[PDB]
From Swiss-Prot:
Residues of the active site: R85, S131, E171
Name of the molecule in the record: Mono-ADP-ribosyltransferase C3
Residues included from the entire protein: 44 to 244 of 251
Source organism of this protein record: Clostridium botulinum D phage (Clostridium botulinum D bacteriophage)
Localization of this protein: Secreted
Top class in the EC scheme: transferase
Location of the TR mART core domain: 4-201
Reaction(s) this enzyme catalyzes, per UniProt: L-asparaginyl-[protein] + NAD(+) = N(4)-(ADP-D-ribosyl)-L-asparaginyl-[protein] + nicotinamide + H(+)
Length: 201
């Protein structure tokens, strides 16, 4: 199957804005999504720390998590689509935090091989929500790891950009507790990034 890759910002914004108009998110769901864009590091951190169990969270955060989860009943992609994410070295593991990059900002080729052994052709489970973009935006251009997610028609996926507190990210949110499979891992032309291709489940 083939996955729509947006190659133009205006095309992407237009498609996304059209999807957002159809969602019919409630007042509470919108409020929860706005807050997510302000506090995503905290929310996703707590979900990872607790392996998806929200029972011990403060009551306002439980409600927020439930409203985000519920939002995806209304937010599905109408087609196969490619989504993009940038990540820092710790995404690969604690062992990559101060080893993935040499002093030139170029990927250490030995660390790259270890990352390939750890992850290539394997599934990964993410306890947090996954913030992505419809394109490889300049925002995460400093980042050493770029992942391209292949997300199938009908999958839970929401263009939340219109109500995000921040600009320029063409942001598509994926639900928490998602699994994806790493199909391909390779160094970029200039050796400064690892490009990962993954299929969302």
């Amino acid at each position: 199957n083939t996955y729509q890759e947006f190659t133009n910002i205006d095309q992407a914004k237009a498609w996304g804005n059209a999807q957002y108009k159809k969602y019919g998110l409630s007042k509470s769901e919108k409020e929860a999504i706005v807050s997510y864009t302000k506090s995503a590091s905290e929310i996703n951190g707590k979900l990872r720390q607790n392996k998806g169990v929200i029972n011990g969270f403060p009551s306002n955060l439980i409600k927020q998590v439930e409203l985000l989860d519920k939002s995806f009943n209304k937010m599905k992609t109408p087609e196969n689509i490619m989504l993009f994410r940038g990540d820092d070295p710790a995404y690969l593991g604690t062992e990559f935090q101060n080893t993935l990059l040499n002093s030139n900002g170029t990927i250490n080729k030995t660390a790259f091989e270890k990352a390939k052994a750890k992850f290539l052709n394997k599934d990964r489970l993410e306890y947090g929500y996954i913030s992505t973009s419809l394109m490889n935006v300049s925002q995460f251009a400093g980042r050493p790891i770029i992942t391209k997610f292949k997300v199938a028609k009908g999958s839970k996926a929401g263009y939340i950009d219109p109500i995000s507190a921040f600009a320029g990210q063409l942001e598509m949110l994926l639900p928490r507790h998602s699994t994806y499979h790493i199909d391909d891992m390779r160094l970029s032309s200039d050796g400064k990034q690892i490009i990962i291709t993954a299929t969302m489940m």
